Design a protein around this ligand. Sequence first.
Ligand code: HEB
Lengths: 94, 102
Amino acid sequence: ADPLTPAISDRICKHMNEDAASAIALYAQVFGQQTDVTMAQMQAIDPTGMDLVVESEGGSKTIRIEFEQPLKDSEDAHQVLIAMAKQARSVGKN
Amino acid sequence: ADPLTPAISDRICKHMNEDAASAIALYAQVFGQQTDVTMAQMQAIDPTGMDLVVESEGGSKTIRIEFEQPLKDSEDAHQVLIAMAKQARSVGKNSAENLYFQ
Ligand code: HEB
């Protein structure tokens, strides 16, 4: 139940970039409305949103995705990210 | 750098059964040599191995997967589990098919 400190953010991003690099690209494609996503890495996460580095058509744009509900702790972030991954996977397969 | 205590095992297994249920089935399929796995849940994890409950059309079999290298801490476990999931996915991409001739 750790608060979303910058130290926690770097930890979440570090692990998210290696374990769920697939989900990060889906975030950029579905919620970030990015086409032709090659790679996507998480740069930061805070209570109100997350920042993604999206590689596309030989170009590295950084986008920001705002959570509808503000996050309070690490567990809150965990639950939103898992749900967003499911929502993204459903839309991508269709 | 948390040691792999029984309390840590319960936490890892809980999260792995929630966010990684797909990868635990690949563990049963690839490393556990189980064919036609319906569901697979992780029951326990310790430095020398992990215990899986594998359901295969009403089988509910408990198998044990022994790690090549003993785990040292929770970070080591984290790394090992990810590589095993990637490896399991890779072998799955090299698909096998019964072969028949014209
Ligand atoms: C933040 C919070 C968190 C935490 C603490 C964690 C922790 C963890 N984890 Fe995690 N994960 C996560 C969040 C997380 N996580 C996510 C979000 C994901 C995603 C899922 C998907 O992909 O969708 C994962 C995912 C995951 C997976 C899957 C991947 C693949 O692809 O296969 C695995 C195996 C893991 C492991 C793990 C471990 C061992 C641990 C302990 C250290 N993970």
